[PDB]
Design an enzyme around this catalytic site. Sequence first.
Site, short mmCIF file in Angstrom:
data_model
loop_
_atom_site.label_atom_id
_atom_site.label_comp_id
_atom_site.label_asym_id
_atom_site.label_seq_id
_atom_site.Cartn_x
_atom_site.Cartn_y
_atom_site.Cartn_z
N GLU A 206 1.14 -1.24 -0.18
CA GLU A 206 0.06 -0.34 0.24
C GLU A 206 0.78 1.20 0.28
OE1 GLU A 206 -0.30 2.60 2.54
OE2 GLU A 206 0.45 1.83 3.64
N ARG B 29 -2.57 11.02 6.09
CA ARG B 29 -2.05 10.25 5.22
C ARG B 29 -3.98 10.50 4.20
NH1 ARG B 29 -0.43 4.81 5.85
NH2 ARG B 29 0.11 5.26 3.67
N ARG C 49 -5.64 5.54 -1.02
CA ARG C 49 -4.55 4.83 -0.74
C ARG C 49 -4.34 4.37 -2.36
NH1 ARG C 49 -4.29 6.64 2.66
NH2 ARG C 49 -4.26 5.63 5.31
N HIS D 296 -10.69 4.63 2.38
CA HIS D 296 -9.79 3.70 3.67
C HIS D 296 -10.13 2.04 3.44
CE1 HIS D 296 -7.16 2.42 7.31
NE2 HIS D 296 -6.22 3.71 6.96
N1 LIG Z 1 -7.41 -2.28 6.73
C1 LIG Z 1 -7.04 -2.57 6.60
N2 LIG Z 1 -5.69 -1.49 6.93
C2 LIG Z 1 -4.01 -2.19 6.57
C3 LIG Z 1 -4.01 -3.84 6.12
N3 LIG Z 1 -2.30 -4.19 5.83
C4 LIG Z 1 -2.65 -2.80 6.09
N4 LIG Z 1 -2.89 -2.19 6.42
C5 LIG Z 1 -2.53 -0.85 6.07
O1 LIG Z 1 -1.21 -0.29 5.91
C6 LIG Z 1 -0.53 0.22 6.73
C7 LIG Z 1 0.17 -0.78 7.40
O2 LIG Z 1 -0.16 -2.15 8.37
C8 LIG Z 1 -1.24 0.73 7.45
O3 LIG Z 1 -1.49 2.25 7.09
P1 LIG Z 1 -3.13 2.80 6.66
O4 LIG Z 1 -3.26 2.45 5.35
S1 LIG Z 1 -3.47 4.16 8.18
O5 LIG Z 1 -3.97 1.18 7.08
C9 LIG Z 1 -2.63 0.37 7.23
C10 LIG Z 1 -4.67 -4.86 6.37
O6 LIG Z 1 -5.07 -5.66 5.60
N5 LIG Z 1 -6.41 -4.36 6.38
#
Ligand SMILES: Nc1nc2c(ncn2[C@@H]2O[C@H](CO)[C@H]3O[P@](O)(=S)O[C@H]32)c(=O)[nH]1
Length: 96
Positions: free
Chosen positions: A54, A65, A69, A85
Amino acid sequence: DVSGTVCLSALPPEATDTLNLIASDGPFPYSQDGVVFQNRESVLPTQSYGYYHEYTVITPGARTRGTRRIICGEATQEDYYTGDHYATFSLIDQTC
Ligand SMILES: Nc1nc2c(ncn2[C@@H]2O[C@H](CO)[C@H]3O[P@](O)(=S)O[C@H]32)c(=O)[nH]1
């Protein structure tokens, strides 16, 4: 599930900036850019750990942020956009 495909030209301009940074291997504006996306909710197709990464799509004016994404997959041109998100995803079409 993936919601459909969207032309890169129909997404916010900052999505193009993120994709260009991904093509050059950064540098990225945030330290969290490029970490593994686990797909814990099972919204995208099931893959091994590490298949997805991501990256932030900058929200103009935000202090954090925000909610946009880009998620890349290991396949050629496999990139998904999320504006809420990780609730919904669209596959990005870079040809239009
Ligand atoms: N909802 C969600 N967020 C994830 C997952 N894997 C990583 N993320 C996200 O990517 C980053 C690392 O864990 C974090 O910053 P963010 O975008 S606020 O939300 C978390 C996932 O499986 N689900």
